[PDB]
Amino acid sequence: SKISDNYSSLLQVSEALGRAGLESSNLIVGIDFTKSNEWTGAKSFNRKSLHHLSNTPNPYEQAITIIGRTLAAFDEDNLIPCYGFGDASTHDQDVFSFYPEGRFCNGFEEVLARYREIVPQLKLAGPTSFAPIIEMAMTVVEQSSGQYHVLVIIADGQVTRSVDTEHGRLSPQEQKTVDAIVKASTLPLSIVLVGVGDGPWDMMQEFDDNIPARAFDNFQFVNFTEIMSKNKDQSRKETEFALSALMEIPPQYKATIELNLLGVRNGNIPQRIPLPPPVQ
Ligand SMILES: [Ca+2]
Ligand SMILES: [Ca+2]
Ligand SMILES: [Ca+2]
Numbered sequence: 001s002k003i004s005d006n007y008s009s010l011l012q013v014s015e016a017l018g019r020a021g022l023e024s025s026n027l028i029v030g031i032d033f034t035k036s037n038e039w040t041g042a043k044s045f046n047r048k049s050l051h052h053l054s055n056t057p058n059p060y061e062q063a064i065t066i067i068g069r070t071l072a073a074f075d076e077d078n079l080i081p082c083y084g085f086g087d088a089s090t091h092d093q094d095v096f097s098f099y100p101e102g103r104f105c106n107g108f109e110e111v112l113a114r115y116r117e118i119v120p121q122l123k124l125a126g127p128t129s130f131a132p133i134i135e136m137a138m139t140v141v142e143q144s145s146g147q148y149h150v151l152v153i154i155a156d157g158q159v160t161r162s163v164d165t166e167h168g169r170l171s172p173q174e175q176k177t178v179d180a181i182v183k184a185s186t187l188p189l190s191i192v193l194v195g196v197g198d199g200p201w202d203m204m205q206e207f208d209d210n211i212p213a214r215a216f217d218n219f220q221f222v223n224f225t226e227i228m229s230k231n232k233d234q235s236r237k238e239t240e241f242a243l244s245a246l247m248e249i250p251p252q253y254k255a256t257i258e259l260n261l262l263g264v265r266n267g268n269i270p271q272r273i274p275l276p277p278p279v280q
Contacts, residue, residue: 002209003217003248010243016250025148025253027075028140029067029111030095030133031060032155034086035124040156040197044225050156050197051119059196063154063224064115067194068108070242074150079104081140082111085133088123089278092160092173095132097274121279127160131176134184134191135272141187142269146262148253150190152245154224156197157204174203178211185215186266188256192220192245199225216255220248 007013037050041059045052050059057065072078081104083095090096098105098114105111130153137151160173170178184191193204201223208221222244227237256262 001217003220003251005247006251007243007247010239010246013243013246013250017246017253020250020254022148022250022253024076025074025150026077026144027071027080028137028149028151029064029080029082030136030151030153030155031082031084031115032086032128032153033084033090033119033122033124034126034128034156034158036126036128036158037124037156037197040158040199043198044229045197049124051122051124053116053120059224059228060115060119060154061112062228063194063196064108064112066238066241067152067154067245068111070238071152071245072108078107080108080111081105082114083133083136083274084118084122084277086124086126086128087278088125090132090275091125092127092129093132094275095136095272096277098277100276102274118277118279127173128158129173129177130155130159131173131180132272134177134180135270136274137189137191138180138184138187138269139272141189142266143271146188146264146266148188148190148256148262150192150249152192152194154194154196157193157195157199157201159203161203177207178213181207181211181219182214183269185218186261187269188261188263189218190220190249190252191218192222194222194224194245196224199223215259216252217248218252218255220245
């Protein structure tokens with residue numbers, strides 16, 4: 001069933017997590033390194049690459065930063081596995097871990113630092129699929145033996161789609177992504193898409209609201225550009241962000257219990273091996 005925006009404040013969300021008795025959670029981060037990032041900054045990052053490093057922070061650095069300031073409490077041990085996808089070394093088939101022997105980022109300061117160190121060494125490629133990053137998350141959950149996890153994907157939302165194709169027929173990248181979201185709902189996993197750049201967002205919204213085959217609504221879309229573009233205080237922007245990111249988490253947590261996913265090994269999850277970071 002679909003999960004609406006049931007909470008109008010961060011406070012309501014924390015109470016809702018309180019009533020549901022959330023005691024433990026961990027984060028997983030995935031980062032879109034596809035070529036489309038070079039042109040989805042046309043309006044919102046002044047015709048620059050969304051991954052372009054400079055004196056100003058790019059939307060990815062901004063999103064990492066706010067995630068660290070608003071969501072760090074939801075990773076119980078401050079160690080965050082981070083993965084990249086869609087560069088020339090992974091295309092639409094694989095992900096790579098930020099560090100060689102899969103070692104984790106200690107805190108989101110290191111996530112930000114490691115991102116900065118990695119990105120200019122990457123050939124941004126494609127095609128764009130969320131299938132590998134979601135399948136990587138699935139493997140992290142299955143290996144922890146059903147420990148509750150939130151996958152945060154920071155991306156520009158431009159999954160390789162058909163066009164024009166009226167049809168209702170899906171590109172392989174889109175179909176595999178939907179298949180992964182469906183399969184993911186056999187595990188105690190929440191997905192939050194932090195959308196950066198110009199969009200368009202119709203497809204992310206469809207992942208958010210309309211996938212009939214999945215066991216429960218396991219996917220939330222946060223339009224990061226739209227929240228940051230508001231004429232509000234920085235403190236109010238972070239609250240709006242945290243509220244958007246967490247909106248579906250209490251019902252999703254509860255759903256993992258009602259559907260008997262939490263703490264349970266599914267036994268039917270392919271083990272995805274991350275590639276090493278393609279760097280020096
Ligand atoms: Ca962790
Ligand atoms: Ca949703
Ligand atoms: Ca939603």
